[PDB]
Write a protein that binds this ligand. Structure first.
Ligand SMILES: *[C@@H]1O[C@H](CO)[C@@H](O[C@@H]2O[C@H](CO)[C@@H](O[C@@H]3O[C@H](CO[C@H]4O[C@H](CO)[C@@H](O)[C@H](O)[C@@H]4O)[C@@H](O)[C@H](O[C@H]4O[C@H](CO)[C@@H](O)[C@H](O)[C@@H]4O[C@H]4O[C@H](CO)[C@@H](O)[C@H](O)[C@@H]4O)[C@@H]3O)[C@H](O)[C@H]2NC(C)=O)[C@H](O)[C@H]1NC(C)=O
Ligand SMILES: *[C@@H]1O[C@H](CO)[C@@H](O[C@@H]2O[C@H](CO)[C@@H](O[C@@H]3O[C@H](CO[C@H]4O[C@H](CO)[C@@H](O)[C@H](O)[C@@H]4O)[C@@H](O)[C@H](O[C@H]4O[C@H](CO)[C@@H](O)[C@H](O)[C@@H]4O[C@H]4O[C@H](CO)[C@@H](O)[C@H](O)[C@@H]4O)[C@@H]3O)[C@H](O)[C@H]2NC(C)=O)[C@H](O)[C@H]1NC(C)=O
Ligand SMILES: *[C@@H]1O[C@H](CO)[C@@H](O[C@@H]2O[C@H](CO)[C@@H](O[C@@H]3O[C@H](CO[C@H]4O[C@H](CO)[C@@H](O)[C@H](O)[C@@H]4O)[C@@H](O)[C@H](O[C@H]4O[C@H](CO)[C@@H](O)[C@H](O)[C@@H]4O[C@H]4O[C@H](CO)[C@@H](O)[C@H](O)[C@@H]4O)[C@@H]3O)[C@H](O)[C@H]2NC(C)=O)[C@H](O)[C@H]1NC(C)=O
Ligand SMILES: *[C@@H]1O[C@H](CO)[C@@H](O[C@@H]2O[C@H](CO)[C@@H](O)[C@H](O)[C@H]2NC(C)=O)[C@H](O)[C@H]1NC(C)=O
Ligand SMILES: *[C@@H]1O[C@H](CO)[C@@H](O[C@@H]2O[C@H](CO)[C@@H](O)[C@H](O)[C@H]2NC(C)=O)[C@H](O)[C@H]1NC(C)=O
Ligand SMILES: *[C@@H]1O[C@H](CO)[C@@H](O[C@@H]2O[C@H](CO)[C@@H](O)[C@H](O)[C@H]2NC(C)=O)[C@H](O)[C@H]1NC(C)=O
Ligand SMILES: *[C@@H]1O[C@H](CO)[C@@H](O[C@@H]2O[C@H](CO)[C@@H](O)[C@H](O)[C@H]2NC(C)=O)[C@H](O)[C@H]1NC(C)=O
Ligand SMILES: *[C@@H]1O[C@H](CO)[C@@H](O[C@@H]2O[C@H](CO)[C@@H](O)[C@H](O)[C@H]2NC(C)=O)[C@H](O)[C@H]1NC(C)=O
Ligand SMILES: *[C@@H]1O[C@H](CO)[C@@H](O[C@@H]2O[C@H](CO)[C@@H](O)[C@H](O)[C@H]2NC(C)=O)[C@H](O)[C@H]1NC(C)=O
Lengths: 105, 145, 127, 127, 145, 127, 145
């Protein structure tokens, strides 16, 4: 129906806590994941199942949400966290990615 | 022991109470964690008389990667649950799946006047349990008017 | 087997007792029809307008004792279903009815418990 | 539940009463077998010679009270079938039997109605 | 109330009386006016013990203009009515027909030891109703000899 | 209907009596479960480890009276199956239960047979 | 008559005793002489609670010379007999065969918790009969430990 991700762009100094939102097309029925894609490279998931984080991902990354509204939060921003962040949704046998959130320092 | 009297066999009723009233997670993601597929267990059914209005209902279709639906074929007596506030339409996949879908808590997949051990294909249900109680003709008429 | 009834002191009562997790409101549906042409299968309701709405108020955790009864009776109901081999539906109301008759009558002494026979009017007629 | 019996004054009697449309003759068929080798399923009857013929004479509109009973009991039977979800056959003889036991026994005072206990031989043994 | 006694559960019998004994029209044209097709109603069945010898029986086959028979598939337990004086063989057509055939009077399509809400395909029946009565072993033996 | 019980003088007793062909040993299997997680259908047994083993010793031709009972009861059971038209399974335990209630209660005089009412404690309370 | 008391409906049990305990021929050649095919007889089933450990069991497949198996299709509730000492795997042929296989002695083809009038296709069975008896909760627990 409609999958949105806000904000579209972002600019925050180093050390700031920034949160991003993701709205799924339907009520969540499978794992919701979050990916970090630095310019040029391939995406890399940091958070899976809305809350859990992959082994090796820094502790500053966190996530929460329920239903159709979800959030992605980083506690203390660092210079190598600049990337376009996407949220993944698997509904109706379709993997759909969010518009993405470009964060700048 | 002698407390209470039963007049006719129609007065004994089986009421199905949804797990939604037990304040458990209604979300389909957490609800899908309560079911699992297992081989070697026969499916059993029990008919009941009354049931609760469900807060969330589910119409799931778990399929093989080839397309084969792993849920059982619903017998004729199985029909959609009567009253649902919201019906989640879910389409899943499970390649390793074997056997038939059962409830991990021991609850029943409530269908219209039927409680089932297995989730049937293409039929709306709700998680719940049933309870045996006696209400005579006059008392039953008062509650439903 | 418990029973729900109008309060003898529209309030109702439940005979069962167990010795904030529950939901207060309890909307229910039933198929019972009030006692001209509605009983004929062609006429009357179909599958849409077949269920009648009801509501039970929580009076001294009335709904919660009902909800905690179904949470507990299912543990025995699952074991009672393992023995029967029929995959189709299995009538439970007939079994509860005969269990009610057997627990009341299924040799009993007129005096004392385990024998529900009323002699209070017999003791006055003998004198 | 009514009952048909030999006349106590082959004439028969029916306990039921309702308070030229009927047919006088009443031919019937049944499967009951008289009590060597016929009980084995391979032997005995098949599907042709399985039914035994019977005849009930109209004595004080006996057949007409039977025919007007089925015309009336079907109106409740249709409502009793709306609740059960099983499309297959549903045993009614078991339900009438337990309804007969519950209407006779399902706490009752030894004196007065609603309690069929015979004390006529008990009242003479006490004296 | 205490009048009458029931010894064994075999003694309670359900007798099916044909509408022919009620002096209603036996002709298949007037009899076809007593049935109609309706969707959204489940078919129900009740077994009985004894039945009347029918004056007229019907073996109907109502089909789509394409050829599709609109009558339900008879389950295994359904069999032709035992005793019929005359059996009308009828082949009908109904393009608008939906659902399943029911009785407009509320009567039952009597089959062998079975009363049905629906008329089944390719099975002889008769219109009638059933009645509950008690006859003990000795009385039942006298009527049928 | 007979009944098997512990001996009142692990020896058992059978109430039935009929008035070297039999096998002495009698191994049996049952599905009854002893009364945490085993009752849930997903957990507990499947179709392999579902049956529990048992053994009944022949004490005063105990097993032989059991074996000669099934050899005889089948002759009536086959006739009881000819009437029911359902090809599927047919519950016999419910029918034996209601037959037990009807043979004990289905009008009876407090004195004499055919009426199992205990007055031995009533005769002392009146004096 | 008043001897013995029945507490709950679960206490009445139906025990199936094999014909092996009756010291009849267990050999499949002599056992095949006890069955025969007949048309015009409906198959009936009765469920029981307990059964004996069988000495010899049979998994037979009687087929037409074309290859058509003449045994009935087993319903879902029918399953292999639980405990067998030896299972004879037999493949037969019968061109003249009509109807369905019945027992000439009047015994039952014992399946798992089911006694049948007919031998079903591809399902292990044993010849036996069932008996009605009452054992209370405490007595039943002692025998099976
Ligand atoms: C009547 O109503 C009551 C209450 O509404 C309801 O009770 C519920 O029962 C179910 C079980 O039937 C409970 O589910 C269990 O929950 C516990 C606790 O979960 C908490 O703790 C874990 C770990 O700390 C947290 O991660 C979690 O977020 C919760 O906070 C779990 O421990 C159980 O999981 C184990 O058992 C499962 C059985 O299916 C296994 O599938 C699972 O893998 C777990 O196994 C464990 O042990 C294994 C070996 O030892 C190991 O391999 C595993 O990895 C794991 O360690 C289970 O999920 C539920 O919580 C109860 N609800 C409440 C509110 O208490 C009744 O069921 C209901 N009755 C009916 C008939 O409906
Ligand atoms: C036990 O035994 C009794 C007696 O044997 C039996 O009673 C029968 O009940 C049925 C209904 O179940 C009766 O059938 C009705 O008959 C009346 C009267 O018909 C006469 O009058 C008309 C008009 O004057 C004449 O044309 C006709 O020739 C007759 O002389 C009809 O009025 C009924 O039709 C209406 O209702 C039908 C319901 O199915 C509709 O389908 C039909 O269209 C009719 O509707 C009317 O109203 C509509 C809106 O108002 C309108 O749209 C229509 O056009 C029409 O105006 C119906 O046919 C039957 O007569 C009874 N038999 C007797 C001898 O009295 C019981 O049924 C039986 N019980 C059981 C359980 O079997
Ligand atoms: C409870 O337990 C008991 C005992 O365990 C069990 O009894 C058994 O019953 C069956 C019948 O149901 C008996 O089978 C019959 O056996 C007799 C005797 O056979 C002996 O004699 C013949 C001839 O002398 C010898 O060749 C043979 O080797 C034996 O020594 C047979 O006569 C019977 O066959 C006739 O009847 C059959 C019925 O199916 C026919 O199929 C067969 O063709 C035979 O018919 C005769 O007459 C016809 C016309 O008159 C003619 O055309 C035929 O050619 C033939 O002459 C039958 O096989 C078995 O022996 C009993 N067992 C014992 C130990 O006595 C119960 O059945 C059991 N109850 C339940 C419910 O399971
Ligand atoms: C639940 O899902 C099933 C299947 O996904 C739906 O059944 C379909 O219903 C439509 C409309 O009646 C038919 O055209 C399809 O052929 C059906 N498919 C199957 C597989 O049965 C069903 O309608 C859904 N229920 C709800 C309440 O949405
Ligand atoms: C349904 O239950 C109510 C309440 O238990 C019954 O009303 C009672 O009737 C008895 C006998 O007439 C009186 O002694 C009580 O005082 C009544 N109680 C109340 C609260 O009114 C009623 O009779 C029952 N209805 C049926 C059809 O059995
Ligand atoms: C079937 O019913 C008849 C009649 O009701 C029973 O015969 C009666 O038996 C009682 C007790 O022996 C006598 O007091 C009556 O006088 C008899 N009546 C008649 C008309 O003969 C008969 O016993 C019943 N049969 C069974 C097996 O219960
Ligand atoms: C009623 O009609 C049905 C179908 O019109 C008849 O069933 C046919 O019976 C013949 C002979 O047994 C078979 O060859 C056909 O294949 C059957 N057709 C169907 C669709 O089942 C049935 O015999 C008729 N009954 C009577 C009494 O005439
Ligand atoms: C199962 O049966 C046994 C034996 O019949 C019951 O034990 C008897 O209990 C009564 C009443 O307490 C005593 O008077 C007898 O002396 C006991 N007999 C024996 C042999 O111990 C036992 O109570 C029954 N169990 C259940 C649950 O009903
Ligand atoms: C009895 O025989 C039947 C058929 O001869 C066996 O059923 C086969 O089982 C295998 C393995 O599960 C399947 O691959 C076949 O498709 C089955 N065939 C049929 C026709 O069902 C059955 O396993 C045998 N039982 C025993 C105990 O040996």
């Amino acid at each position: 129906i409609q999958m949105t991700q806000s904000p579209s762009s972002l600019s925050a100094s180093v050390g700031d806590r920034v949160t991003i939102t993701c709205q799924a097309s339907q009520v969540i029925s499978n794992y919701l994941n979050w990916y970090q894609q630095k310019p040029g490279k391939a995406p890399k998931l940091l958070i899976y199942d809305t809350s859990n984080l992959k082994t090796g991902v820094p502790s500053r990354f966190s996530g929460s949400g329920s239903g159709t509204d979800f959030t992605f939060t980083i506690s203390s921003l660092q210079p190598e966290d600049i990337a376009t962040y996407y949220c993944q949704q698997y509904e109706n046998l379709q993997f759909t990615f969010g518009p993405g959130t470009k964060v700048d320092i | 022991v002698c407390s209470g009297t039963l007049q006719k066999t129609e007065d004994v009723h089986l009421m199905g109470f949804t797990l939604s009233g037990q304040k458990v997670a209604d979300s389909p993601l957490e609800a899908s964690k309560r079911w699992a597929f297992r081989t070697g267990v026969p499916p059993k059914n029990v008919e009941y008389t009354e049931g609760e209005e469900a807060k969330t209902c589910y119409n799931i279709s778990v399929t093989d990667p080839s397309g084969k639906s792993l849920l059982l074929d619903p017998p004729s007596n199985i029909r959609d649950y009567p009253k649902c506030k919201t019906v989640h339409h879910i389409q899943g996949q499970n390649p390793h799946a074997q056997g038939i879908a059962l409830h991990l808590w021991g609850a029943f997949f409530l269908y219209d006047r039927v409680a089932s051990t297995t989730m049937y294909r293409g039929k709306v249900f709700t998680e719940g349990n049933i309870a045996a109680m006696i209400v005579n003709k006059t008392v039953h008429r008062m509650i439903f008017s | 087997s418990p029973s729900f009834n109008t309060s003898t002191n529209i309030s109702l009562t439940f005979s069962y007792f167990p010795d904030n997790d529950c939901d207060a409101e309890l909307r229910i549906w039933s198929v019972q029809e009030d006692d001209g042409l509605s009983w004929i299968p062609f006429f009357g309701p179909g599958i849409e307008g077949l269920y009648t709405a009801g509501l039970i108020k929580n009076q001294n955790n009335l709904v919660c004792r009902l909800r905690r009864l179904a949470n507990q009776t299912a543990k025995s109901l699952e074991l009672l279903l393992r023995v029967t081999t029929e995959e189709r539906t299995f009538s439970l109301i007939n079994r509860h009815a005969i269990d009610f008759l057997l627990t009341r009558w299924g040799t009993c002494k007129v005096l004392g418990p385990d024998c529900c026979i009323g002699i209070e009017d017999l003791s006055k007629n003998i004198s």
